[PDB]
Design a protein around this nucleic acid. Structure first.
Lengths: 165, 131, 137
RNA sequence: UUAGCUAGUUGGUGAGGUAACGGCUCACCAAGGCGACGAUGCGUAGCCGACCUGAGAGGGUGAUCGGCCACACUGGGACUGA
RNA sequence: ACCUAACCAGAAAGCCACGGCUAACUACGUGCCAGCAGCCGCGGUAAUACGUAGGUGGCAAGCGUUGUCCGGAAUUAUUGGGCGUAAAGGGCUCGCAGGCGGUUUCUUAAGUCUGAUGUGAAAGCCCCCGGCUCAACCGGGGAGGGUCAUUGGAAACUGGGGAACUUGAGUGCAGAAGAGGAGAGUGGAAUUCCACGUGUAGCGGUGAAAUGCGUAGAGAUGUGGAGGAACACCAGUGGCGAAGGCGACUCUCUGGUCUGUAACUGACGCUGAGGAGCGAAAGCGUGGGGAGCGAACAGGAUUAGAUACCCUGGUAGUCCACGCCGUAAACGAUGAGUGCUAAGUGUUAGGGGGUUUCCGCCCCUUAGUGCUGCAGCUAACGCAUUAAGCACUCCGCCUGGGGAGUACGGUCGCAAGACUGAAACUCAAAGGAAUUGACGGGGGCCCGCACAAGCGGUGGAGCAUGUGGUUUAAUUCGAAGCAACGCG
């Protein structure tokens, strides 16, 4: 919580539009499946999609998936608060905090997700699974678990800006 | 049993740290004592009140984590393994977390914190690490 | 692995196999050992021209015959190109790269080497197939 | 898929020897010594500053310049001389 | 070298790629032929993959191929992997060495950390400048590099030493329980066999039969005797044990577990490679025992075939004692120890209690064991206070499949073999879970001239038409299971 409304300009990058076929009586009923993640360009970057009959249909159900969910990703100016090895679903992600002009060095689903979700310098090299859905899953859990310093002082009551460096 | 005491306390604050319990027990020792004053003074738990008695023990701390899931004890890790010991020099005393957490290196003048131990500028046995 | 277990028994190694037998040499004056030196390409006196069957489901006629190398080994190499001035008793210069269809091509003789001839009547790519510069004019 | 090895070997005393201690070599005496913390045996190899690669830990090579050791057709030997 | 003047654009551009990975596309020819290829894989007359031509793209006095090394490779994992089913828990225990260890307190500096000196030569890597027109390069100025020595401090933590304390662990005291074991003895029910009575023509077995037994009197039934093996009922996802495993009853000798206060001891503990020991059943040696069962074997059956399934027989073995064998799906496919973390419901072995003489209900409590499930774990199934959760100690195992637990070498074995245990070549798959469909001589439910129930046919006869075939100069082409054949 809270579920952020679709109230901004979405990026709508496509992660990958995979084939799929249910092996039924008569061959294989082929249906496209695409998990393409929409991005707000400020921090609302959510990545889920569905299936449909045509390639544009998978674009439509994917965009409906982007209007489903969104994440926060609090990070003070080309970084995250604590560079935590965040992966959930058998596919890791090792995203550290990088400097200002160190670029968004990430992979396929990491470079799509962080590349369309407001990243400036966050070094990322995975360790684990390589499915698309597993990449957006563990990357979404890792981006949805990294803590912000002001709120981290505001919820653990020691002092705000008492942990600096 | 009794492989390591500090790992028993850290497993206590961890398992109770996810259980959502109000108070937490412990085995009362000088590491639970000085680590209770350090980890209580840094503002994770509400209060440690070491209710001592015969024969040994026994500390009793309360989880100072409010409504928001995961309070000031948000995750702990054995940075020093009793069995294969960590080490950290002056310049190599690593501050765990980066900006959120804090590590507790057992310095040569008392069980310090991360930033205070870097303030003394002398490291020692990496006592525990609270990410 | 425990810190005492991996700290006393050790970690086993990851030794993988070589990509092709080209020993270097051996030099048999006078030991006949005599490897490894592992040269970039061994050049030896050929064995016999011919053509073997390609592996399934490929159905073509790859032509590659054995080459008694200049060190002692005899691994058969599938000669590159269409057209070949390599016949029986002529030497060739074997170079690496495992073939695909027929099982067991441990060399690919350099079409353009000392003994062999280059690809004639071919001018779109001439590093491989070894033909000279383009047609004059 | 090397658990045995060692008899000048382990140690003593005495004498000789070299720039010098020393089984370094001999006489006499004793029965020692090394080994799972890998002896011995097979194999391979000049080693190092370093070079290449890696985010780093590490992995690989010992070219060219330098430092030390070794060798000088193969195998011994001693003379001149500091 | 460099400078100056003149001269001429005159002499100075190629290599690889253009499906993906991966920037880069169309035509002609070729037609599974010639070929390409790093992998995926293309090529069998419309090839963005083979050559050729235009164009594009990368790079550049260079460009590709190959050889080797690093990374990718979290694919040796200290950073940073795992072991229920994917590869991986040792079959299980006891233990030496080793690895790790309850709380308080004094000393120590052996580790831990920090300051000072020495030294880690130059050249090189990095930082800061300068010089060759800049750059490569050179030079100067720095830095960093050590279980390094010598030496000064801190004593928090591991350790040394001394003092302590008690829950850990052990002893005691009292309880409880069990198919824990070893030896001896005893008892029945049942089968076989034997002796005799009674009696006749079948008994037996099967899907159906036959072999076999029976008029020499079987089966059945009555009585009695001999001998071996296993103990029905209690008996149950009950109990005990380290595991394999352990069942009639009684005795001797013996180990162990849990409960309860709590007398003592004061960490005396956990794991533990080697080493030691035990380990179903099959086997192996000897000597006993052979009632049932019963490989090999004999006969008969079923089948096209039956070195099998079935039936009738039948040796070794099963049994015992003494020795060797040391493997199993030795399974919970889960190593041991310890601490913590929702709950319910059983079930033995105890204990405290609330009233209860009783009894009985209920709570609290252990210990052990079964189900149902929260958090959490996971690839999914699933586990879940008996974890596969959460952390610590230690041991063992795992690094794609085949080759192959094979070869060779060792150790043991009386053997049978057991342990240990490779490689050359080859392939891009093996594999775990889950889904969709299919299949089934799997089960369930149902329907239809499907079957059953009746009618009338066909296949037999002559003839009509079509097909196959054979012939022909041609017997035009198309259809070939129902759905080709009185079809177009």
């Amino acid at each position: 919580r809270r579920i952020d409304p679709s109230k901004l300009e979405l990026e709508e990058r496509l992660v990958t539009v995979n084939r799929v076929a249910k092996v039924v009586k008569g061959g294989r009923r082929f249906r496209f499946a695409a998990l393409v993640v929409v991005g707000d360009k400020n921090g609302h970057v959510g990545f889920g999609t569905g299936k449909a009959q045509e390639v544009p249909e998978a674009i439509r159900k994917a965009v409906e998936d982007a209007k489903k969910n969104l994440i926060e990703v609090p990070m003070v100016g080309t970084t995250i608060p604590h560079e935590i090895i965040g992966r959930f679903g058998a596919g890791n992600i090792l995203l550290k905090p990088a400097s200002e002009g160190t670029g968004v060095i990430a992979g396929g689903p990491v470079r799509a997700v962080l590349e369309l979700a407001g990243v400036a310098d966050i070094l990322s090299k995975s360790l684990g699974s390589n499915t698309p859905i597993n990449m957006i899953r563990a990357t979404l859990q890792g981006l949805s678990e990294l803590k912000r310093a002001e709120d981290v002082a505001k919820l653990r009551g020691k002092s705000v800006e008492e942990l600096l460096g | 049993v009794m492989t390591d005491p500090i790992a028993d306390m850290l497993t206590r604050i961890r398992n109770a740290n996810m259980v959502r319990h109000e108070k937490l027990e412990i085995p009362a020792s000088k590491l639970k004592r000085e680590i209770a004053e350090i980890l209580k003074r840094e503002g994770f738990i509400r209060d440690v009140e070491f209710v001592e008695d015969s024969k040994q023990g026994i500390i009793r701390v309360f989880l100072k984590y409010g409504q928001n899931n995961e309070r000031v004890i948000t995750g702990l890790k054995r940075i020093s393994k009793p069995g294969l010991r960590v080490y950290a020099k002056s310049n190599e005393v690593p501050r765990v977390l980066n900006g959120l957490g804090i590590a507790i290196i057992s310095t040569s003048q008392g069980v310090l914190t991360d930033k205070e131990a870097r303030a003394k500028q002398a490291g020692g046995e990496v006592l525990a690490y609270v990410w | 692995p425990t810190i005492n277990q991996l700290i006393r028994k050790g970690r086993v190694s990851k030794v993988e196999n070589s990509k092709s037998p080209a020993l270097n040499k051996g030099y048999n004056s006078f030991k006949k050992e005599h490897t490894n030196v592992s040269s970039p390409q061994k050049r030896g006196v050929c064995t016999r021209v011919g053509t073997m069957t390609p592996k399934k489901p490929n159905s073509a006629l790859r032509k590659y015959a054995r080459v008694r190398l200049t060190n002692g080994i005899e691994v058969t190499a599938y000669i590159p190109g269409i057209g070949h001035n390599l016949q029986e008793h002529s030497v060739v210069l074997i170079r690496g790269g495992r073939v695909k269809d027929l099982p067991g091509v441990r060399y690919h003789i350099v079409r353009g080497a000392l003994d062999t001839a280059g690809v004639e009547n071919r001018a779109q790519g001439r590093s491989k197939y070894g033909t000279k510069k383009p047609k004059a004019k």
